[PDB]
């Protein structure tokens with residue numbers, strides 16, 4: 271007998287068609303079964319097995335029925351309306367181009383918005399097997415974990431990297447190589463997808479090889495529903511217990527959000543849910559009570575005391591201190607710029623991000639007040655006998671640096687004129703020497719996160735109005751958008 | 767038999783004319799097929815293949 275058949279037999283199997291390989295196959299095969307398992311006989315010994323799984327024949331046969339899919343996406347993700355409309359485009363388009371084409375997409379946005387899930391779900395629809403392949407530091411493995419050559423790889427994180435192009439280049443991806451196994455391989459039918467946050471670290475080379483989709487974040491409204499129709503049941507079922515075991519009243523869910531999560535995704539949200547799913551169960555086993563109802567009063571008896579503040583029931587107006595809406599890699603955020611007055615020379619030194627991008631803007635809001643002075647109420651003998659300190663907290667992403675113009679401006683004035691920025695207002699906008707207010711980036715996410723921390727008024731660029739259209743109903747409804755074109759406009763509304 | 771021919775054969779092939787190279791060719795070739803695929807026998811093992819494709823006479827009638 272001998273194991274000279276156990277392998278060989280399944281080798282000539284229907285699996286393993288291509289002969290370009292079978293050469294190298296029986297080659298290292300008819301090798302040295304002579305002699306026993308020497309230190310040598312253990313080597314190539316294994317080389318054969320990795321080689322046995324690498325799919326060839328098999329390959330999911332695919333179903334592409336939009337009427338479903340599009341509304342299977344609506345079974346496992348709440349909102350993302352616009353993001354789906356673009357997953358289907360990537361299919362209705364697929365169906366025609368019978369062979370998947372180079373442009374493979376990256377999903378981008380704050381973590382916890384569903385990037386990973388959308389993928390799994392893209393694949394559920396295509397009935398291809400799905401594989402996560404983390405790139406925090408090798409497709410080699412990939413296929414194996416799916417012994418079916420028509421998969422969906424999800425290059426999870428391409429941006430926590432320290433060049434691989436070869437693997438995706440439409441021209442080359444067809445013929446695929448890999449050391450320690452050197453032999454071409456066909457990846458024709460392989461739906462590739464990428465996750466990502468800070469679109470920077472991604473290599474320019476790659477970002478062009480790939481088509482991008484942005485998942486955005488979520489309105490209180492949205493989250494809430496995500497909690498009710500997906501998040502909760504999922505955690506219930508996962509902490510093994512019944513829907514009849516624990517229910518949380520809407521208002522409490524809202525509370526969990528406003529007060530224990532200031533994220534744009536829903537990861538923190540999920541975690542606090544579980545907190546309860548957990549607390550819940552220990553009851554169900556001991557007390558045995560078949561039901562547990564967490565309410566807006568109970569909440570503390572589950573997830574602790576409040577964690578973030580929401581609104582102005584606490585804060586109270588300040589001087590030379592404005593709250594600018596900035597575009598963090600992780601959503602809208604509320605970084606506050608400050609300005610301080612110490613005797614000296616016209617020089618101005620700023621802190622925080624070293625910012626060479628900032629100085630330009632700073633010494634412009636500066637170079638504005640330089641002009642229109644008495645007109646603003648401030649001793650013209652100032653740039654001559656004061657020294658101004660500015661602090662611009664890190665977070666805003668590169669493109670959006672100059673979007674803090676009207677902010678530093680507003681502060682520098684509020685600081686010089688002993689006035690006071692209205693704690694309620696959040697602002698964003700680029701400044702010019704003359705005092706012009708130029709267009710800004712991502713007003714959507716900005717006001718989204720402006721609402722999250724619960725501000726009232728949100729001063730922004732006039733030439734940005736056609737951007738308010740796409741701001742989700744719920745938030746555009748709790749905000750009074752003051753639009754402006756020159757400082758004085760901003761100053762009049764943000765100071766008191 | 768042994769794979770002592772699978773490669774060698776296609777080496778003396780019409781492909782691989784220039785002799786300035788063939789030296790370094792059969793050189794690292796008549797190397798150490800002795801012994802088995804040791805941690806060593808995997809090294810130069812491949813060095814030969816990259817060398818097999820590199821063109822030497824395939825001119826495209828312009």
Ligand SMILES: Nc1ncnc2c1ncn2[C@@H]1O[C@H](COP(=O)(O)OP(=O)(O)O)[C@@H](O)[C@H]1O
Pocket residue numbers: 346347348349380381382383384385386387496500501535536537540
């Ligand atoms: N819109 C959404 N619908 C359903 N689940 C969501 C949604 N957004 C986030 N989640 C949570 O995350 C999982 C899928 O999203 P997730 O992968 O966490 O976002 P990320 O991809 O950044 O982690 C779900 O199991 C759920 O816990």
